[PDB]
Amino acid sequence: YYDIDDVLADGTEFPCKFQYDIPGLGYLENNPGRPITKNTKLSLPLWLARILAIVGPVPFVELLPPDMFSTKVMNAIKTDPVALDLHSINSHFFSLAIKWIMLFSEKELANVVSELLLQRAQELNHHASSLSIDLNANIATSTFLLKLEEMEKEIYKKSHESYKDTKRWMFKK
């Protein structure tokens, strides 16, 4: 509730489709102060979309399949989890996937996401373990780092700091 990343994740826009005729809800639409007809298609933030979908018999809104959980993205995930660039797809992919799974009680997406997370964490740990050495006194690391999601970035930072602290303590003069 007070965790910053969770607040940001809930702000992403998801496709929606109203099922009732609600005058005066134009401010959600592009134009203000006009009635919104049924079946109208628009994107709403997750915080408003989820509650409107669950509450409202025929609810107020129907959550259409997003573009982040499409067949193309699933196939790319299955084909090459490590090479897939998740940041461009979304910066809160794992959080939004967990929320979607909780909302819809589905197991195929859960399996796919679990496999993707495990296969990505393998390389994440490899990179975190990899540490530099100063002989006098990179490219792949940064290339992979550019592809990471926010949660993966946090895990990478924690693990890298732990490894660095252990190495520093071990080799302190």
Binding site: Y2, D3, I4, V7, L8, I22, Y27, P45, W47, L48
Partner: protein, 196 residues
């Protein structure tokens, strides 16, 4: 829409958190974003006006049940989102202030008046805690386990003959001491000495 200002405020909060994480030793809280919070509160007031108008229309008007329900729910959800964003921002700032207060034994222009009062009261509370049965321990002490009884230290900033509880240390700049770590731990903490 409605939550864009709150989203921007939370983005700024994330920036502040990242700055705090990156910073090694010295941290200075950014200026309190008074204007954004003022705009958010004005938006909340507008939403309250909308809710009052909807209630009045329902009391005397042609509005039906479904429309009233949907509008009321949308307004309430928007207010909840704005409240959550404001509270998250304030909580992050308060946590950073709490860490700063604990770092000291017990500028401010960036803080607001409420935050300054909060910091003063928290420092008073920390001192009161230190005044209890834990007087033998120094709660606001070093969290690094003691390793060496005797260490070499070097004076970093000139100061007079400061009379500490353990003894009198005439801190002449660029002069080394071979003393116990416990005796000069506080001086190292304040930056007068250095372990080298």
């Amino acid at each position: 829409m409605y939550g864009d200002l709150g989203n921007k405020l939370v983005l700024e909060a994330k920036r502040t958190k990242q700055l705090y994480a990156r910073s090694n030793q010295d941290v200075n809280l950014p200026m309190y974003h008074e204007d954004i919070i003022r705009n958010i509160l004005k938006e909340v007031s507008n939403l309250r006006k909308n809710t009052e108008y909807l209630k009045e229309q329902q009391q005397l008007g042609m509005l039906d049940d479904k429309v009233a329900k949907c509008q009321y729910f949308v307004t309430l959800l928007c207010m909840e989102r704005n409240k959550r964003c404001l509270l998250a921002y304030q909580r992050l700032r308060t946590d950073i202030l709490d860490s700063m207060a604990w770092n000291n034994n017990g500028d401010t222009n960036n803080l607001s008046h409420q935050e300054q009062e909060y910091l003063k009261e928290y420092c008073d509370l920390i001192t009161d805690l230190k005044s209890g049965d834990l007087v033998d321990i120094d709660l606001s002490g070093s969290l690094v386990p003691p390793s060496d009884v005797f260490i070499d230290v070097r004076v970093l900033k000139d100061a007079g003959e400061i009379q500490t509880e353990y003894g009198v240390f005439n801190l002449i700049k660029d002069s080394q001491f071979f003393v116990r770590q416990s005796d000069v731990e506080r001086l190292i903490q304040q930056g007068y000495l250095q372990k080298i």
